[PDB]
Amino acid sequence: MIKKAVLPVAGLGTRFLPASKSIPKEMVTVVDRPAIEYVVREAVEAGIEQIILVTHSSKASIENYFDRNFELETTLEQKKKFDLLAEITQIVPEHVSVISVRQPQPLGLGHAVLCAKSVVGEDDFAVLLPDVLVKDGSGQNDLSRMISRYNSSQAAQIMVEAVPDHLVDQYGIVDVAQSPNEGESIAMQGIVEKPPVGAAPSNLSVVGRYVLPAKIMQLLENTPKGAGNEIQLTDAIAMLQDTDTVEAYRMQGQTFDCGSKLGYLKAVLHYGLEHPKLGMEFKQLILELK
Amino acid sequence: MIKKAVLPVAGLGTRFLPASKSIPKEMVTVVDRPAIEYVVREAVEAGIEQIILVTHSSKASIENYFDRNFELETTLEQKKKFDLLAEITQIVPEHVSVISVRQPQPLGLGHAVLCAKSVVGEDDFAVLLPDVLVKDGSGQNDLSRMISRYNSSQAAQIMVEAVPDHLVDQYGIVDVAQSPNEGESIAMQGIVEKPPVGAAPSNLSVVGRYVLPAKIMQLLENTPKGAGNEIQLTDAIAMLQDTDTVEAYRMQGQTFDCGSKLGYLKAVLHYGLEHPKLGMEFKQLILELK
Amino acid sequence: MIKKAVLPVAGLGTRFLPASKSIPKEMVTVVDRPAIEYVVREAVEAGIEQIILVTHSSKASIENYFDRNFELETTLEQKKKFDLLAEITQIVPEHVSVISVRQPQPLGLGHAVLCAKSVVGEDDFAVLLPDVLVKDGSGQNDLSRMISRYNSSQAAQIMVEAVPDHLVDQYGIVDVAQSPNEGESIAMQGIVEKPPVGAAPSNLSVVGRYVLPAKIMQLLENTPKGAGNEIQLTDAIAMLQDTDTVEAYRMQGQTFDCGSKLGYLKAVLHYGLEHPKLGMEFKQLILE
Amino acid sequence: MIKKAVLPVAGLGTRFLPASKSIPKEMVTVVDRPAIEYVVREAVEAGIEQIILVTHSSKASIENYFDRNFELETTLEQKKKFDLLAEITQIVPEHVSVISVRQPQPLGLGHAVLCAKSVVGEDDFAVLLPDVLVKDGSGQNDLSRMISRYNSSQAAQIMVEAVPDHLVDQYGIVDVAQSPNEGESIAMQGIVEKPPVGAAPSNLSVVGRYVLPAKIMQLLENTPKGAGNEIQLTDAIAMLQDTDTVEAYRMQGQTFDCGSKLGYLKAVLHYGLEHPKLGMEFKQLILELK
Ligand SMILES: O=c1ccn([C@@H]2O[C@H](COP(=O)(O)OP(=O)(O)O[C@H]3O[C@H](CO)[C@@H](O)[C@H](O)[C@H]3O)[C@@H](O)[C@H]2O)c(=O)[nH]1
Ligand SMILES: O=c1ccn([C@@H]2O[C@H](COP(=O)(O)OP(=O)(O)O[C@H]3O[C@H](CO)[C@@H](O)[C@H](O)[C@H]3O)[C@@H](O)[C@H]2O)c(=O)[nH]1
Ligand SMILES: O=c1ccn([C@@H]2O[C@H](COP(=O)(O)OP(=O)(O)O[C@H]3O[C@H](CO)[C@@H](O)[C@H](O)[C@H]3O)[C@@H](O)[C@H]2O)c(=O)[nH]1
Ligand SMILES: O=c1ccn([C@@H]2O[C@H](COP(=O)(O)OP(=O)(O)O[C@H]3O[C@H](CO)[C@@H](O)[C@H](O)[C@H]3O)[C@@H](O)[C@H]2O)c(=O)[nH]1
C-alpha cells in the first residue's frame, strides 16, 4: 500500500564541503559503499518499489550508482571477477525502480519534496532524508514498522528519538503528551522546526523518516516561506494537524547524522565494526593506533 | 484526461554517429535549439504535464536542458541580456515536470517504454519517439486530436502517414480496410514491424506518435523475445488488438526523421525557413549558392 | 617548427543559445559532426600535433569526442559496422596529443591563452578561436601558409579579411600600408580591439587565427584589462609590435562565425553541399 | 629543478568497489576530503608546480576538484561563510598548473606515463601513484628528500619499503646491494614486477613514488608487455639500469593502499586522529566504542 519513497538529494555540499566539492555528499564513502545505498536499502527492506530522487544538475553519480555501467561490467569479466560483478549489478532488486526529478533552486526540503508531487500523484508515500543513516538489528527495521502502523491507523507517521535538551535548536521537535515506548506511536498535537533551547515542546526530535498522505503536496503549495526564508516540510505537517491526525513513532534503533563531518566519522566507526567481512580485522586496527 | 507522455531517449546514436559520439542524438542542434525541445514543445501544446524521459547514463544534457543552469543564468544577468534569460528559464511552463528513468540495457523501444511502467501507473499515456519531429499548421496540433479522440473512443490511437511502397522495409505498417482521411482515425485489424517491401497490409507507416492504456505495460512484460534483435512495441500492440480496440489516426501534419542524417538536414531546411526571426534571411542565404 | 595549437574553449555560448545551453557551443552539430572537429582538422592538416584545450567545468564533451568511447566502439566492433566505427575511432591521427587545462575564471582571450603558458613553455605556437571555422582552399589550407611564413619571416602572423565598415565595430582591426593581397602577408603598424564604427584604421578584421612567439606569454602577463575589463590578445600583439615586426596574413579561404545564428546556418549550407556522401542528395532537398 | 609530476588515474577502481562504482577511486573521501588531494598536496610541498593527470572519460570530478566551482563559491560568499570558502578555493597554490591528457586504452602503468610524453617534454619528472598515500610526519616529506637526492646524484630515484616475505608478489621489488637505511638511497642492480613468492631479490617493494629522467619516455616507447598484457614501468626502469645508475630510496614516512579496503580504513583512522578540527573529538569517539 505504501510503495513510493522521496529522497531529497538536491542540497550542495556546505555542511560537508571539502569532500563534497566535486562529488555529491550523498555519494561519500562509508567504509566501502556510498551513504545513499544505506538509505535506499533501508527503504527497500520496507517494501519500497519506487525510489524518487529529488536531485540537482550535479548529482549524476547518484543516478548512475543504481544503474548498469557497461565499461565496468566488461572490465569485471576480462578480469574473471564475477564476485563484484554481482554486487555492482544487483545494488537493488529488479522489481525496484529509481526515478529522477530536478529541484530548479535550493528553496529547502519542503520545495524539494513538492518537486516529487507529479510522481507521487495520489499514493501515500514515505520520505527519507539521506543525510541520516539508521542502523537497526533483530527482525524488521523502524521504517517497516511506521508504514504498517500508517496502514492500520490512516494517520501520518513521523519518526522521533529523544535528544539532549541543548541540541534541540538543531532538529525539528514534536509537541506530545507523554513520549511513546520504543517501537510504538503516540498521537502528537504540534511540531516546530527551529525551537530555541528551553523553548522546546519536548525533547523528542524529528529523525528524518516520514509517512505522509498526498494531501501534504497541496499543503506544501500553500505553506508560508518561513524558517530561514526556505519552505519547510515540518510547517506543512502542522497544516495537516489542523484537519487530519498525525502520530509520532519512536524508533528502536540508533541513528547517525552524515550531515556533520563528525557524525559521518561516527557512522564509519559503527558500520565499520558491524561490517561482516572486515568488522573484526578493523577492530584490531583501532587497538593498535596509540 | 491523458497527461503523461513517455520519450524513449535511451538509445546510443549509431545512425547519426560522428555527431552523436559525445552528446545525445536528441541534443543535435536543428536550427538553434536541440531536436528534443521540438518534441517536448509538441507534447506540452497537447496538455502533457509530465515528460517521462527513458534515458541512458550519457544523456545528462537532455535532463539538464529542461532544468535551471545557475552559472549561465548569472552570466546572462551580469551581462544585461534579459532577452535570452526568459527563453532559457521558461523552456517549458512551470506546471510541466520532467521525470527521468534508466533503461539498464538497450533491449529495444518496447523495453524502454516498459521502463516507465511505475511512473505511468494506471493512467492512459502518450508515447513520442523523439528521433521524429511533426511540423503542423493552423488550429491545434496532431497529437492534440489523437488524445481528444482516445478519450471519447476509449480505444488506443496510433499515428499513421502514407509512405512509398518500397520504404515499407524501414517502418512499422498497419492493417486497415479503407485508408483514413487526414485528421480522422479508422479502426485497424493488424500491425507488422519490419514487413519486407511488397508484403505489407498497406502503405500506412506508424509515424511514432501513440496514445496507449496502462494495460500495454503488462503486455510488454510478456511480449515475444523480439521482432528483430530485441522486444518491439508494435508486437505489444498486436496483443492489444486480441482484446481491446486499436484505431489508426492519419495525421494532417508533415513529419521529419532526425534519425537518418539526411532526414535531419531536410528538417534543418524546413524549420529554418519557418523561423520567425532568421526565416527570410535564410531564404536569401540559400538563393546565393552555386 | 610550429607544433602546438591553443584553442580557447572556456567561454559559455551566450551568443548561441538555447543551442549551447546543455552542450558546449563547440559541439554544435554542423551537417553531421561537431564544429570543433573542423577547427582541429584545420590544425592537424597544417602539421599541428598538440591541440591544447583551455576549457571549463562544463565542456567534458570536447575531451570525450577526441578519445575512445568504449561502449560505442565495442557495440560497433561486434555488429561489424566498420563504416561508422571509422567515423569515431580515428578522428585525429594517433601521433596527435589533446591536452586540457581549465581557465579558472573567464577574464578574457588573453588570460585564456596565458593559461596554456606552462604547456607551451618556450615553443612558438598557433591560436585557433573555435567559434570561427575557415573553409579549406585550393590544396594548401590558410593556416599552413601562415606557419611556413612565420617559419621564414620569424614574424608573428595574424589572419585578417575585409568586413563592411559598419560591422568593424566588433572585431580587432589592424593598420596597414599597402593593403595585403589574397594569400599574402604584409607588415603592420598597430592593432586595436572592438574600435568605434568610423575612426578604425582599416576594414581588415582579426579573423581568429594567429601564429605567435612564446614571448607573447610575458606580454600577456603584463597586458591589463582592455575591453569589458577583459584581458585582450590584441593588446599583447600591440606590445609585441613595439619591439619585433608583426605581419597581417590575408585569407585565401572562406570563413564562418558559428557565434552568429546566421553564420552557423551558412556553414551548414556550404559544408552541406561540399559533404562527401550527403552533398549530392542534399543539393536535391534544397531544390524542393 | 624537478617541477612536473605525472599522476596516472586512468584505472577504474575494481580493487575498491562499490566505493568507486560511480566516483573515481581518487575521490574516495578520507576523513573529510578526496584521496587525490593528499597525493597532490604531497607533490606541491616538494616544489611540484605542473601536476599532470593521465586520466579517463569517467574521471571529470578530479579536474573539477582542482578548479573553481561557480555555484558553490557564490553561494558561500552569500552566507559570508569564509571558513568553507577557504576549503574549496586555493586547495593548491595559485602558481600550480593542472594538466589533463587521456589514456585511450588501459595498456598499463608504463603506457600510462608514456601518454604524458608531449607535456613532460625533455624535463626530468616525478610519478605519484594516487592509490598509495604517504604520510610524512618527519617535517620534510619523503618526496622532497627524494627530489633533492636525484638533483644531487642525478640518479633515477625509486621509493621502497619492507613488506612481509609473503605478499611480495603484489608489488615490484628491487635488487639492493648493501640494504639501504631509513630515509636514504643505495644503488640497485635490477628490479622485477610482481615476482613469485619465492623468486624475490628482497622484501623491498616499489611503493608508488618515483623520480625519473625523460630518457624513460624513449625506453617506454620500446618495452614490450610485462606482467599481463600490460607495459610495466618497472620493466622500463630495468632498461635504464642497463646504462645509468638507478638508486632505491627507502621510506622514512608511513604509507596506505586505498587500493585495499583496510589500507583505506587505516588512512581514515590515522589522518583522522591527526585532523586539526576533528582529531580531538574523533579520538573521543574511538574511546566511546564499548
Ligand atoms: O532545497 C533543498 C534543501 C535541502 N535538501 C535536502 O534536505 C536534506 C536535509 O534538509 P536540511 O535543509 O539540511 O535540514 P535539516 O537541518 O537536515 O533539518 C531536517 O532534518 C532534521 C533531521 O536531520 C529534521 O529534524 C528537520 O525537521 C528537517 O527540517 C538534505 O539531504 C538536503 O540535501 C534538498 O534536497 N533541497
Ligand atoms: O532500446 C532502445 C531502442 C531505442 N530507443 C529509442 O527509441 C526510439 C526507437 O527508434 P529505433 O530504435 O530507431 O526504431 P525504429 O526503427 O524507428 O522503429 C520504430 O519507429 C518507427 C517510425 O520511426 C515505427 O513505425 C516502428 O513501429 C517503431 O518500431 C529511438 O529514439 C531510440 O533512441 C530506446 O530508448 N531504447
Ligand atoms: O575568458 C575567455 C574569453 C574567451 N574565450 C574564448 O575565446 C573565443 C573568442 O572569445 P570572444 O570573447 O568571443 O572573442 P571576441 O570578443 O569576438 O574577440 C576576438 O574574436 C574576434 C573573432 O570574431 C576577433 O576579431 C577579435 O579581434 C578577438 O579579440 C571564444 O571561443 C571564447 O569561448 C575563452 O575561452 N575564455
Ligand atoms: O593502464 C593503466 C594502468 C594503471 N594505471 C594507474 O596506475 C596506478 C598504479 O597501477 P596499478 O595497476 O593500480 O598497480 P600495479 O600496477 O599492480 O602496481 C603498481 O603499484 C605497486 C605499488 O602498489 C608497485 O610496486 C608496482 O611497481 C606498480 O606497477 C593505478 O592508480 C592505476 O589507476 C593507469 O592509470 N593506467
Q: What is the 3-state secondary structure (H, E, C) of chain C?
A: CCCEEEEECCCCCCCCCCCCCCCCHHHCEECCEEHHHHHHHHHHHCCCCEEEEEECCCCHHHHHHCCCCHHHHHHHHHCCCHHHHHHHHCCCCCCCEEEEEECCCCCCHHHHHHHHHHHHCCCCEEEECCCEEEECCCCCCHHHHHHHHHHHHCCCEEEEEECCCCCHHHCEEEEECCCCCCCCCCEEEEEEECCCCCCCCCCEEEEEEEEECCCHHHHHHHCCCCCCCCCCCHHHHHHHHCCCCCECEECCCEEEECCCHHHHHHHHHHHHHHCCCCHHHHHHHHHC
Cα distances from D135 to residues B85, C46, D142, D143, D281, in angstroms, run 49, 48, 9, 11, 21
Q: CB contacts < 8 Å between A and C, how many?
A: 7
> Residue B190: which H helix or E strand, with range?
strand B190-192
The best mutation among A109, A170, A260 to test binding of ligand 1, ranked by most ligand atoms within 8 Å of the C-beta, falls on A109
Q: Is D228 left (phi over 0), alpha (psi -120 to 50) or beta?
A: left
Method: X-ray
Q: What is the dihedral of CA A253, A257, A261, A267, to 10 degrees?
A: 20
C70: which chain A residues are within 8 Å (Cβ-Cβ)?
A: 70-71, 74
Continuous H helices in chain B: 35-44, 60-65, 70-78, 82-89, 109-114, 117-120, 142-153, 216-220, 233-241, 261-273, 279-287
Of D69, D75, D265, the CB nearest to A285: D265
A74: which chain C residues are within 8 Å (Cβ-Cβ)?
A: 70, 74
CA angle centred on B142, ends B138 and B148, rounded to 5°: 110
Q: What is the resolution of this structure in A?
A: 2.9
Q: Does C63 touch chain D (CB under 8 A)?
A: yes
> Residue A209: which H helix or E strand, with range?
strand A204-212
Please report which ligand is nearest the Cα atom of A169. Answer: 1
The tally of CA atoms less than 13 A away on the side-chain side of residue B19 is 23
D127: number of Cβ within 10 Å? 24
D99: which chain C residues are within 8 Å (Cβ-Cβ)?
A: 99-101, 118-119
Q: Which among C15, C29, C270 is the top mutation candidate for probing chain B, defined by the most B β-carbons within 10 Å of its own β-carbon?
A: C29
Q: Please, are residues B99 and B53 in contact by the beta-carbon 8 Å criterion?
A: yes
> Residue A284: which H helix or E strand, with range?
helix A279-287
Q: Which of D200, D202, D203, D205 is nearest to D234 (CA)?
A: D205
For chain B, list the domains and their CATH numbers. Answer: 1-290 (3.90.550.10)
With contact defined as 3+ CB pairs under 8 Å, the chains touching C are A, B, D
Q: Which among D102, D105, D123 is the top mutation candidate for probing chain C, defined by the most C β-carbons within 10 Å of its own β-carbon?
A: D102
The tally of CA atoms less than 13 A away on the side-chain side of residue B171 is 27
Q: Please, are residues B70 and D73 in contact by the beta-carbon 8 Å criterion?
A: no
Separation CA D214–CA C44 (nearest Å): 26
A58: number of Cβ within 10 Å? 22
Q: How far is CA A278 from the centre of its chain?
A: 26
Closest chain B CA to residue A64: B57
Q: Which of B217, B149, B223 is nearest to B193 (CA)?
A: B223
Q: Whose CA is nearest to atom 18 of ligand 4?
A: D171
- In this structure, what DSSP letter does residue B4 have? E
Separation CA A50–CA A3 (nearest Å): 6
Identity at A101, one-letter amino acid code:
V
- Ligand 2 contacts CB of residue B112 (under 6 A): yes
Q: Does B102 touch chain A (CB under 8 A)?
A: yes
User: Residues near C254 by Cβ (< 8 Å), separated by ≥ 6?
Assistant: C134, C135, C270
C119: which chain D residues are within 8 Å (Cβ-Cβ)?
A: 97, 99, 119
Residue B189: helix, strand or coil by DSSP?
coil
With contact defined as 3+ CB pairs under 8 Å, the chains touching D are A, B, C
* Grid coordinates given for B167: 520504404
Cα distances from A3 to residues A46, A155, A244, C54, in angstroms, run 9, 16, 21, 48
Q: Which of D126, D195, D209, D206 is nearest to D160 (CA)?
A: D206
Task: Tell me the pairing of strands D97-102 and C97-102.
Answer: antiparallel
D74: which chain B residues are within 8 Å (Cβ-Cβ)?
A: 70, 74
Query: How close, in Å, is residue A19 to chain D by CA atoms?
Result: 4
Closest chain C CA to residue D60: C60
Q: Which among C53, C55, C63, C96 is the top mutation candidate for probing chain D, defined by the most D β-carbons within 10 Å of its own β-carbon?
A: C63
> Residue A82: which H helix or E strand, with range?
helix A82-87
Q: Which of A109, A121, A135, A125 is nearest to A54 (CA)?
A: A109
- Ligand 2 contacts CB of residue B11 (under 6 A): yes
SS3 letters across chain D: CCCEEEEECCCCCCCCCCCCCCCCHHHCEECCEEHHHHHHHHHHCCCCCEEEEEECCCCHHHHHHCCCCHHHHHHHHHCCCHHHHHHHHCCCCCCCEEEEEECCCCCCHHHHHHCCHHHHCCCCEEEECCCEEEECCCCCCHHHHHHHHHHHHCCEEEEEEECCCCCCCCCEEEEECCCCCCCCCCEEEEEEECCCCCCCCCCEEEEEEEEECCCHHHHHCCCCCCCCCCCCHHHHHHHHHCCCCEECCECCCEEEECCCHHHHHHHHHHHHHCCCCCHHHHHHHHHCCC
Task: For residue A131, report the distance from its CA to the centre of ligand 1, in Å.
Answer: 8
